[PDB]
């Protein structure tokens, strides 16, 4: 049995896959600090945001395709890798690690560091692009042009992968935290209510689409002039209004991307068409606005939240 591990650090989920077994831990990227020292990490955590009590903190060390706080995420880390290993494994363990396009050296030099004070002894790094393709099934190792967009949390990520490299890659900060942040501010410039990061996050789920029609929830937050809770009911096509503007900074980003391509590796793109991944990929009628925007057929991968890391485990094993 071994004890290699890839791992995806994700802003929103961190995901492990172990060599021999697959995929084994799916938790939250959340830290929860009492008053510091580490009380709860992932699942836990998670359920604490916008719940701590004034001797307690929830953290995410990750927010926009960046490491934030350094510390609090070195922690997390370790405690994940700590969560897997398994003692009657094999030793030297081997650890791919996930990271941006657009990751600086620090952030790099740190993510490694990190690992091995965790027990790593060796550490090697993927595009996230890369692994996003391969998790989703691409051809990335043929002679054609193949395009995926990983919408997650902190950031999207739109590459473009032939010969098992990169023909193009871009990053941009928009994704699930902002997508929740639109709908926080549409409650509070037309319903004069404030919601939380979570109730927001739920209504995206919910209701949350990239094109209006309809159907309706309720939304619990506060009326900010006498403020005191107050629910008011939210419809699919309200839901598409907040959304309008970070779903439309995606669907550029696509284009820019095609702009980009040479003409042969754009027409394989438009054969089999454009792959979304990330749990961004999740958010209705999303793949419906790219392909109707880009003309292009598009393509909701399987298990989007899993992509990056099964692209990853699949080159541990190999
Ligand atoms: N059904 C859904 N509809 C809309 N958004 C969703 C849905 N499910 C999950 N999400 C969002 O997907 C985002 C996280 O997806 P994820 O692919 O895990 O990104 P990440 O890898 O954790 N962080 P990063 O890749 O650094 O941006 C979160 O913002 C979720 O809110
Ligand atoms: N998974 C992503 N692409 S965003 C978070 C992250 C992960 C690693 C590093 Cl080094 C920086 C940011
Ligand atoms: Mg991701």
Known sequence: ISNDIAI????????????????????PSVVALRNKVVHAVGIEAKQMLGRTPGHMEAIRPMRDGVIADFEVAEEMIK???????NRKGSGNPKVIVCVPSGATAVERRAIN??????????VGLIDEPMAAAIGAGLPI????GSMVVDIGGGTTEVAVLSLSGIVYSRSVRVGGDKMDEAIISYM???????????????????IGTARAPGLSIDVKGRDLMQGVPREVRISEKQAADALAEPVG?????????????PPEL???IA?????????????????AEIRDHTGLPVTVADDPLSCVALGCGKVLEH
């Open 141 to 144: 190792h043929e002679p054609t």
């Open 249 to 261: 900074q995606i669907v550029e980003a696509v284009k820019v991307a095609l702009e980009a391509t």
């Open 8 to 27: 995806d650090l994700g802003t929103a989920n961190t995901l492990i896959y172990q060599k021999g077994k697959g995929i084994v831990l799916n938790e």
């Open 266 to 268: 754009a027409s394989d």
């Open 79 to 85: 405690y994940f890798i700590r969560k897997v290993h």
């Open 113 to 122: 560091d990190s690992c091995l004070n965790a027990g790593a002894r060796r």
């Open 271 to 287: 054969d089999k068409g454009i792959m979304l991944t990330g749990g961004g990929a999740l958010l209705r009628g999303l793949d």
């Open 188 to 206: 509070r410039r037309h319903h004069n209510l404030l919601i939380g990061e979570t109730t927001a996050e739920r209504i995206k789920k919910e």
